[PDB]
């Protein structure tokens, strides 16, 4: 059993995140105690939960218990995997039901006790206590740091342009196509969302119609050491032209906000022309556009739509659509 932090802005979009990777991974959520996920899979799920861009952590899930009383002595029953030193470290939900004032140091004595040692400034193995309608015990196996992050925003870019989505976003958008191999961004921009896919390490393709974007991105993309990629100067609205005889596993893409409807509805439908049966578009568009019904007249099936305010005058959904 494993278990997944995720962030709380934008909860459903995360949940499905990590739904997308554990249908990679061989595995499915069971259960979610504020925003704790209770995961049914095991090391096959790592490497596609490692790719996860709205999650806080995600480790192994050891103990599950309704009271401390119940954590402890159930702790006392699990073999902890741990290596090195370690320490316990508490989360305390917004919904936490539990006291949980020295836990720390009561699970420790339980774990020491099987022949493990405690290092509170420089652990080995971080033991991990969710609290929240329920108490949860187990190991963290990757933390997902926010700076990383937040180092990659725009300002941060050789080829600076304020006009990417947050990294995390992006990087959740590419995950939501359930992308293996490839994705391909038709209106990419400075990079934002190829840049993600590629340090993923996917294959990536982008088109853009301005020249100068077209060399930004390229700047971009390998300032952070993506070299599987091919840029193209054009049109999202001829990508058959563009792509002659290709099928693209995925594509993900925020378009800019000819008459905007247009654009949307021909860019729907020149996407959907060259995605592969089953393949995933995951797009924005401002809430004005009806973007459900105008890309199911295309064809595609709609599996998301999340809300976002923008600014005090913008707001969108970010969509997944399949073919
Ligand atoms: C706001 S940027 C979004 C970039 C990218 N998807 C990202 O990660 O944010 C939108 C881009 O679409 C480009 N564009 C506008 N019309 C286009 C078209 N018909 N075909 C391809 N690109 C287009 C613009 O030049 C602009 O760079």
Not at 184 to 209: H, K, N, S
Not at 255 to 266: A, G, H, S, V
């Amino acid at each position: 059993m494993l278990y997944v932090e995720i962030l709380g802005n934008l909860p459903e979009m995360a949940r499905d995140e990590v739904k997308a990777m554990l249908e990679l991974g061989g595995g499915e959520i069971i259960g979610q105690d504020y925003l704790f996920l209770k995961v049914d899979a095991g090391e096959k799920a790592f490497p596609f939960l490692d790719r996860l861009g709205l999650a806080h952590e995600y480790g192994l899930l050891l103990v599950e218990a309704d009271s401390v009383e119940e954590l402890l002595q159930k702790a006392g029953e699990v073999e902890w995997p741990i290596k090195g030193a370690f320490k316990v470290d508490t989360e305390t939900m917004a919904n936490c039901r539990h006291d949980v004032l020295d836990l720390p140091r009561k699970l420790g004595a339980v774990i020491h006790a099987q022949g493990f040692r405690v290092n509170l400034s420089k652990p080995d193995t971080v033991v991990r206590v969710y609290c929240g309608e329920r108490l949860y015990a187990g190991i963290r196996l990757r933390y997902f740091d926010p700076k990383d992050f937040e180092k990659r925003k725009a300002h941060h870019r050789p080829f600076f342009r304020p006009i990417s989505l947050h990294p995390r976003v992006s990087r959740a958008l590419v995950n939501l196509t359930k992308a293996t191999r490839e994705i391909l961004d038709p209106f990419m921009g400075a990079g934002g969302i190829l840049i993600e896919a590629g340090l993923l390490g996917l294959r990536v393709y982008g088109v853009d119609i301005r020249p100068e974007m077209v060399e930004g991105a390229e700047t971009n993309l390998k300032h952070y050491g993506v070299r599987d990629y091919t840029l193209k100067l054009g049109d999202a609205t001829r990508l058959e032209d563009l792509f002659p005889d290709k099928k693209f596993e995925a594509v993900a893409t925020d378009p800019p906000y000819r008459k905007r409807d247009e654009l949307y509805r021909k860019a729907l439908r020149s996407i959907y022309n060259v995605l592969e049966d089953g393949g995933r578009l995951a797009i924005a568009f401002p809430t004005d556009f009806n973007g459900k019904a105008e890309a199911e007249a295309v064809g595609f099936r709609t599996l998301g739509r999340y809300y976002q305010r923008v600014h005090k005058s913008l707001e969108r959904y970010f969509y997944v659509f399949e073919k």
